Amino acid sequence: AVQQNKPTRSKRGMRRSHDALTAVTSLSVDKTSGEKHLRHHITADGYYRGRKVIAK
Amino acid sequence: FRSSGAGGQHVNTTDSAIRITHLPTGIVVECQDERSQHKNKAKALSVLGARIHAAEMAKRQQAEA
Amino acid sequence: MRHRKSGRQLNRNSSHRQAMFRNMAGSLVRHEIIKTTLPKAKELRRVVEPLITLAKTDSVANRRLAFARTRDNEIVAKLFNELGPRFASRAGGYTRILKCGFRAGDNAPMAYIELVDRS
Amino acid sequence: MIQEQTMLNVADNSGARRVMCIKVLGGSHRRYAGVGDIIKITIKEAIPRGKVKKGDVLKAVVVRTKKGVRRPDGSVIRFDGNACVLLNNNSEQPIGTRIFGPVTRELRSEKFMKIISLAPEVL
RNA sequence: AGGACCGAACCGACUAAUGUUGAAAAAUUAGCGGAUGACUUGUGGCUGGGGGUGAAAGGCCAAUCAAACCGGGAGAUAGCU
RNA sequence: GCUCGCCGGAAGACCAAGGGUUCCUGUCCAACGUUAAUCGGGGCAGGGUGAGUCGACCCCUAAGGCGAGGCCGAAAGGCG
RNA sequence: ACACAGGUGGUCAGGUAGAGAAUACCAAGGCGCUUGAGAGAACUCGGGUGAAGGAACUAGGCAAAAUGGUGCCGUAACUUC
RNA sequence: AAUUCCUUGUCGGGUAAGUUCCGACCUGCACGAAUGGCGUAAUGAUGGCCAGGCUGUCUCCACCCGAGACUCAGUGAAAU
RNA sequence: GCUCAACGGAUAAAAGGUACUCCGGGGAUAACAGGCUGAUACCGCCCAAGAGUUCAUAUCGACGGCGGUGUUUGGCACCUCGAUGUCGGCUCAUCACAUCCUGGGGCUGAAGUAGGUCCCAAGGGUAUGGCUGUUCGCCAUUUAAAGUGGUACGCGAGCUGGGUUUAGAACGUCGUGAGACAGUUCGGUCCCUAUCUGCCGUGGGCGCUGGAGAACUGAGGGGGGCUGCUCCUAGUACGAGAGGACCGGAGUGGACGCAUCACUGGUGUUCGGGUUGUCAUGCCAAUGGCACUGCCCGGUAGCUAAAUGCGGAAGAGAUAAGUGCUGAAAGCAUCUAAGCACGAAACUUGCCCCGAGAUGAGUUCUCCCUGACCCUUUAAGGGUCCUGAAGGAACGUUGAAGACGACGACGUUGAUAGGCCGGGUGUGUAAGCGCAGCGAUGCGUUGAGCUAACCGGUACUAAUGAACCGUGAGGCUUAACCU
Numbered sequence A: 001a002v003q004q005n006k007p008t009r010s011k012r013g014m015r016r017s018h019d020a021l022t023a024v025t026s027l028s029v030d031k032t033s034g035e036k037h038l039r040h041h042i043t044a045d046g047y048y049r050g051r052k053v054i055a056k
Numbered sequence B: 001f002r003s004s005g006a007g008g009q010h011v012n013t014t015d016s017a018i019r020i021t022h023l024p025t026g027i028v029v030e031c032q033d034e035r036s037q038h039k040n041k042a043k044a045l046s047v048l049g050a051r052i053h054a055a056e057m058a059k060r061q062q063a064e065a
Numbered sequence C: 001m002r003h004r005k006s007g008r009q010l011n012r013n014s015s016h017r018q019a020m021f022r023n024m025a026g027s028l029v030r031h032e033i034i035k036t037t038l039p040k041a042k043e044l045r046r047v048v049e050p051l052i053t054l055a056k057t058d059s060v061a062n063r064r065l066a067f068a069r070t071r072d073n074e075i076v077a078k079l080f081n082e083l084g085p086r087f088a089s090r091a092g093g094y095t096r097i098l099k100c101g102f103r104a105g106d107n108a109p110m111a112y113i114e115l116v117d118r119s
Numbered sequence D: 001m002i003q004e005q006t007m008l009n010v011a012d013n014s015g016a017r018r019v020m021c022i023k024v025l026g027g028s029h030r031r032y033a034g035v036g037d038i039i040k041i042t043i044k045e046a047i048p049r050g051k052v053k054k055g056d057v058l059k060a061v062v063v064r065t066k067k068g069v070r071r072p073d074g075s076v077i078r079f080d081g082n083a084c085v086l087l088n089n090n091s092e093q094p095i096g097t098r099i100f101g102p103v104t105r106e107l108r109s110e111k112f113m114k115i116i117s118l119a120p121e122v123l
Numbered sequence E: 001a002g003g004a005c006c007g008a009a010c011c012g013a014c015u016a017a018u019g020u021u022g023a024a025a026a027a028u029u030a031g032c033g034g035a036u037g038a039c040u041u042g043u044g045g046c047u048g049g050g051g052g053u054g055a056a057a058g059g060c061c062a063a064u065c066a067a068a069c070c071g072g073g074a075g076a077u078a079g080c081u
Numbered sequence F: 001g002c003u004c005g006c007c008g009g010a011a012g013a014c015c016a017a018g019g020g021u022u023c024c025u026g027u028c029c030a031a032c033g034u035u036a037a038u039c040g041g042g043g044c045a046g047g048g049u050g051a052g053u054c055g056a057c058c059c060c061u062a063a064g065g066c067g068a069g070g071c072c073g074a075a076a077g078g079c080g
Numbered sequence G: 001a002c003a004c005a006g007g008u009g010g011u012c013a014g015g016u017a018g019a020g021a022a023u024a025c026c027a028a029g030g031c032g033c034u035u036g037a038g039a040g041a042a043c044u045c046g047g048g049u050g051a052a053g054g055a056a057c058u059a060g061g062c063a064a065a066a067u068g069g070u071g072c073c074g075u076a077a078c079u080u081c
Numbered sequence H: 001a002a003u004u005c006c007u008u009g010u011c012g013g014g015u016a017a018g019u020u021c022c023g024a025c026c027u028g029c030a031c032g033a034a035u036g037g038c039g040u041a042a043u044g045a046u047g048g049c050c051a052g053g054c055u056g057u058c059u060c061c062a063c064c065c066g067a068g069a070c071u072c073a074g075u076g077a078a079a080u
Numbered sequence I: 001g002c003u004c005a006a007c008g009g010a011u012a013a014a015a016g017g018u019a020c021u022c023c024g025g026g027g028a029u030a031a032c033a034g035g036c037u038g039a040u041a042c043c044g045c046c047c048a049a050g051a052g053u054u055c056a057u058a059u060c061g062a063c064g065g066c067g068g069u070g071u072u073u074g075g076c077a078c079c080u081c082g083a084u085g086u087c088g089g090c091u092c093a094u095c096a097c098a099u100c101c102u103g104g105g106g107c108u109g110a111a112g113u114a115g116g117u118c119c120c121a122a123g124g125g126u127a128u129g130g131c132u133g134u135u136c137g138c139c140a141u142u143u144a145a146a147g148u149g150g151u152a153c154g155c156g157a158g159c160u161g162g163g164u165u166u167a168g169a170a171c172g173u174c175g176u177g178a179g180a181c182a183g184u185u186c187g188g189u190c191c192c193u194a195u196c197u198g199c200c201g202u203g204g205g206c207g208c209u210g211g212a213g214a215a216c217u218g219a220g221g222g223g224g225g226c227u228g229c230u231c232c233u234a235g236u237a238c239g240a241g242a243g244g245a246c247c248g249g250a251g252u253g254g255a256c257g258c259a260u261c262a263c264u265g266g267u268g269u270u271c272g273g274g275u276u277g278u279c280a281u282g283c284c285a286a287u288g289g290c291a292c293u294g295c296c297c298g299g300u301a302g303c304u305a306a307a308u309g310c311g312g313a314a315g316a317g318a319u320a321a322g323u324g325c326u327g328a329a330a331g332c333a334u335c336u337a338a339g340c341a342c343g344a345a346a347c348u349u350g351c352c353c354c355g356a357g358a359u360g361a362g363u364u365c366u367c368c369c370u371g372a373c374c375c376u377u378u379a380a381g382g383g384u385c386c387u388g389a390a391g392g393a394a395c396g397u398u399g400a401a402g403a404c405g406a407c408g409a410c411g412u413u414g415a416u417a418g419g420c421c422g423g424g425u426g427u428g429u430a431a432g433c434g435c436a437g438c439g440a441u442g443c444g445u446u447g448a449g450c451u452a453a454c455c456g457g458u459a460c461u462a463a464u465g466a467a468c469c470g471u472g473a474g475g476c477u478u479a480a481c482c483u
């Protein structure tokens, strides 16, 4: 249920090969407010695809 | 076959128990007394000879009387 | 396996999901826009929008049905007075889902579910 | 769907009321018996004087099951009780002379022609 | 009337599953036995280690008991590791 | 704030034990809180406990403890 | 040892159904148990239902299932009555 | 036989089939009379056996509901 | 002046128990397993006295002889006593052939049927129960058969804990006693989140020599491989009869496997209803909450088995034992030495699945990019600007796809999901009102209302204008060509 030897910092770094984060690829710029948001999300000031979908 | 009872592991692995099945008659014996089957086979062949000569001398004392 | 199945479970037993979606449909009717997670908002559409299709016929029966779905007289008196003739001509799709980012407390995908004819 | 340890009712005047299936004949590893399947049974309850005695071991043929039989159209004939008609072990022909209750069309053959020719209702 | 019957609190722990770096150095859950008595419980008091106490299992005596705990003799001795 | 759910011979209210400022208010978020925290039984600062009748003290004794003298025991002490 | 599924003596005892302080839903009153959000694989844990058969399971009917209340009729060997 | 080595004694019953069980037998290895014998109604979370109902125990597993698992965000052990 | 005799004499003077146990140590030394050996065991073989009416070798085979296996009981004490955790069952297996079944044969004291024994053959198959903790065994009924063994007498970091093998108790027996017993009997804690190898799945990374999308050949690997009963040939061959076939053909079964949900069903806490208790909605009415979904009754989709479809084969090649043909060596004989033919569930194909990471990285079809410069250390060199293709990926709507990834459908030129509309289906005559009834209720409106996942439709909602990645004609040497 346990190791018999100490795994090296080589085997430890190899396991963390796939722990790397995937950075955001596209930040769509809103066409009216001109502020950046996530593609298919509303902005931080309540715009989405031009119109003001929700007030602040 | 393995013996069955107390005594521990040494019972539990070694067979040391011999059953002998006499084919043309059908008298069987199951001696299990020692811890070695060689003392348990000859002291089981000693019993069948004492249970076949005890089976014709019993047969020659029914059709005698 | 959930082949051809439908309905979310939301880590909740049956008598809680029916109560929570009642407390939530009775709040989307009152304020016309609420803020909730995105998996809870895609399953409230399946609750609220049959209560506005139930609102397109102002009978004594449908008042008594829509009080069995909401148990709130103020909601039923908004569904049939106000939201009834508001969506009297839309063929479904009475609501709108607006993804609004991620919550600070548990990183949940939040969303705004709102009514269509609101502003 | 008769298996072993199954109490069956009796569908003739052979002299038993209640028998128990102790083997399903007709193949190694064979689980169940439909109708028209030869099973070996023992007699758990008999009338005080009849052709068979309590504790006898003899064959039977299953005439009625509660799981029923499916006809080729998809239709199925389910009864309310498992039944059987006792046989002889060697000749393998029925013992009683007056079959009780209905039987089905799956029982008639060159083997069990006598049983369907003695039963009241052949569904 | 009752070391009477059924059964909650109350006291106990018969089976099973869980748990076994647990929620817990012995418990939980569902069933279980006593439940006016040789019952249970509170607060105080007494019995001290070869001694106590024991409806008696070598049981209990502060998670410790075929002889407690802490201080000393004491850096016991160890043909053994 | 509006709903919803839970317990209700308790998961309510109030004593004694025990704890010892945890109570209350203003303030603060490093640590502490099994996450975060503007919140806390956490940090800092101030406040709060009012009795002829309640409880203790007091008066009375139970077990049991101490024990003038006394009896006993190498000494310590033991019993009374 | 912890903001620990344990343990801690006494007092108060409402409604409806019920014999009851069982128990269900409630009141007064107090809480939602201090990580959440999704997903709806194996597998495990705790539960629900089951065709035909009904102890073939197994060391063993273990576990589950079932029986369950009141009033009345009725009730065997045996017995220390 | 809570006791019997040979022993699954033998015979009967029970079961399709019974090293257990119950009834006899007596050849009691090695019972036996207050380290008590033989009975014994009631009682037993007592040991063994049979029958009835009942059933996922099983044939032979299916499906479902919740809590884990699983992914994401936060915190973050252990034996070795 | 000591049998101090345990005789170089521990003292003149010395028995036991521990399963309540404890410590120091040992694999220096036992029980388990491994190992070495093979006495024994098991299996072959050699001689053939005999048995077999006569006839050693159809079948057994005395007296003796030689080996094999490691397989029983042992022997030795080499590995482990700073732990190698144990019998039986369960669950998975896996190999061996010394074959239980099925297959192919030789001999038979083989009429046939059916046996006998030997040889070849490991492909698949190789019961359920009663008793017992049982392995083992006996028994019941089956079966084509209920194989023998190896794998720590396979398998407890998978399960069980009956037996043994602790502490309690009792009996018999032994002991004066503590206690004892390969004697029984009642009771008695089985722990571990997987680092590595392993294995089952499934991804990411790069490689495959320009990039990308598809379709592929198949080096190889895996799966699969069971078999009865009836009928026909034919009551013919055979036989005094009784009995009863070879070969070949047909049906229909069992167990197993793969698939699927149309059927019969199962579930269906997301559908409909009945109902009890209580609380609430101002009350009646109607509903709702909670009581395991409160208890039930049904039940759509899905998933499923008990449901119903298919599967094993046939063939072919080469064969094993075997049967031969021609045929010498050896004027004959002879299956072999040359040459040739048949010959099995075995072997190779045939059948389904995986499969170019097959680095030996393959083949075919399609698509896409045809800019400028410099720099020095001229090289598969480095930089700048311009450029950004095919395509991919992200995001979103999602799925009869899925743990996550992946896979698939879809993104307004849109049916991808929800909704909506229509139907289907399920529940079984909704509420409100009217009447009949003293009332509970019944009747009518009304097969009504409600109806999840289904089916067919419909842009109503959400699937954005984009942006990001990936680029600029792809090395060298020969060779065949090309004008």
Ligand SMILES: [Mg+2]
Residues within 6 Å of the ligand: A004
């Ligand atoms: Mg090591």
Ligand SMILES: [Mg+2]
Residues within 6 Å of the ligand: A015, A016, A018, A019
């Ligand atoms: Mg990782």
Ligand SMILES: [Mg+2]
Residues within 6 Å of the ligand: B006, B007, B008
């Ligand atoms: Mg012993």
Ligand SMILES: [Mg+2]
Residues within 6 Å of the ligand: B013, B014
């Ligand atoms: Mg051994």
Ligand SMILES: [Mg+2]
Residues within 6 Å of the ligand: C004, C005, C006
């Ligand atoms: Mg769907």
Ligand SMILES: [Mg+2]
Residues within 6 Å of the ligand: C011
């Ligand atoms: Mg969760």
Ligand SMILES: [Mg+2]
Residues within 6 Å of the ligand: C015
């Ligand atoms: Mg509920």
Ligand SMILES: [Mg+2]
Residues within 6 Å of the ligand: E004
């Ligand atoms: Mg009493």
Ligand SMILES: [Mg+2]
Residues within 6 Å of the ligand: none
């Ligand atoms: Mg006690």
Ligand SMILES: [Mg+2]
Residues within 6 Å of the ligand: none
């Ligand atoms: Mg309990």
Ligand SMILES: [Mg+2]
Residues within 6 Å of the ligand: E007, E035
């Ligand atoms: Mg009682």
Ligand SMILES: [Mg+2]
Residues within 6 Å of the ligand: none
């Ligand atoms: Mg203690």
Ligand SMILES: [Mg+2]
Residues within 6 Å of the ligand: E049, E050, E067
């Ligand atoms: Mg002491």
Ligand SMILES: [Mg+2]
Residues within 6 Å of the ligand: E067
């Ligand atoms: Mg001492």
Ligand SMILES: [Mg+2]
Residues within 6 Å of the ligand: E073, E074
């Ligand atoms: Mg000293």
Ligand SMILES: [Mg+2]
Residues within 6 Å of the ligand: none
């Ligand atoms: Mg020292």
